[PDB]
Amino acid sequence: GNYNYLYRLFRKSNLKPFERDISTEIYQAGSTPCNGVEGFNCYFPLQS
Amino acid sequence: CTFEYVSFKNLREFVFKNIDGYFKIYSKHTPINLVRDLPQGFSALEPLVDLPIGINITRFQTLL
Numbered sequence: 001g002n003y004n005y006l007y008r009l010f011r012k013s014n015l016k017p018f019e020r021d022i023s024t025e026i027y028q029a030g031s032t033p034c035n036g037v038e039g040f041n042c043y044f045p046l047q048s
Numbered sequence: 049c050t051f052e053y054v055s056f057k058n059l060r061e062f063v064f065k066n067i068d069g070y071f072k073i074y075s076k077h078t079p080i081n082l083v084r085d086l087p088q089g090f091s092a093l094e095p096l097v098d099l100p101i102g103i104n105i106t107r108f109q110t111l112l
């Protein structure tokens with residue numbers, strides 16, 4: 001399995017045309033804010 | 049480092065806008081003689097640089 005290719009499935013808004021997003025900021029799914037720590041309702045924005 | 053290019057008595061006016069990742073630069077130079085503010089008049093700025101940065105910009109700072 002070549003897990004070196006990544007794609008983003010978590011973002012608060014849809015992209016504009018010709019946009020390139022390199023944000024590593026943790027997606028906030030729940031009401032509780034995520035202060036840089038992932039876990040429950042705090043997910044990494046990239047998937048392999 | 050995706051791009052690198054190397055090339056009051058005067059008035060320098062500039063327009064900076066970023067639409068769809070394209071940074072468009074307009075400019076116009078003219079000599080002036082005024083120490084209070086911008087002189088009252090009309091002039092047209094012309095484009096010289098169109099740089100496809102693809103970079104989000106929300107704030108800027110002027111260097112002296």
Ligand SMILES: *[C@@H]1O[C@H](CO)[C@@H](O[C@@H]2O[C@H](CO)[C@@H](O)[C@H](O)[C@H]2NC(C)=O)[C@H](O)[C@H]1NC(C)=O
Pocket residue numbers: 012013016104105106
């Ligand atoms: C450009 O960057 C700003 C941040 O400097 C973005 O504003 C953020 O937008 C997200 C939603 O996409 C919000 O969750 C953040 O709270 C916003 N932050 C601030 C400080 O405003 C803006 O959306 C970005 N625009 C583009 C074109 O990517």
